[PDB]
């Protein structure tokens, strides 16, 4: 993917509203669309509400998510069986 010489890509507002309660009491779920931003260690503990197209479905960021994208953990298609 992106490169060694470019960084990770995080969408510039998924950090500010996360580094805005840097030192705060509690964690309320964060309302997102940016499924495309990578996950830093900083998020560890957060439960974001990402967008899978019609509903914000929530997942809580843990420490085995810490190299992934935000939207690998939110289905877009629905398929129960044939």
């Amino acid at each position: 993917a992106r490169s060694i010489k470019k960084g990770p890509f995080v969408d510039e507002h998924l950090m500010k509203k996360v580094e805005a309660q840097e030192g705060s009491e509690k964690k309320q779920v964060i309302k997102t669309w940016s499924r495309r931003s990578t996950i830093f260690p900083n998020f560890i503990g957060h439960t974001f509400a990402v967008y899978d197209g019609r509903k914000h479905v929530p997942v809580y960021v843990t420490e085995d998510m810490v190299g992934h994208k935000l939207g690998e953990f939110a289905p877009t298609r629905t398929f129960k069986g044939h």
Partner: peptide, 11 residues
Amino acid sequence: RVERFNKKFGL
């Protein structure tokens, strides 16, 4: 994982 991330980049 957390350590791997920082190592690859610089953080």
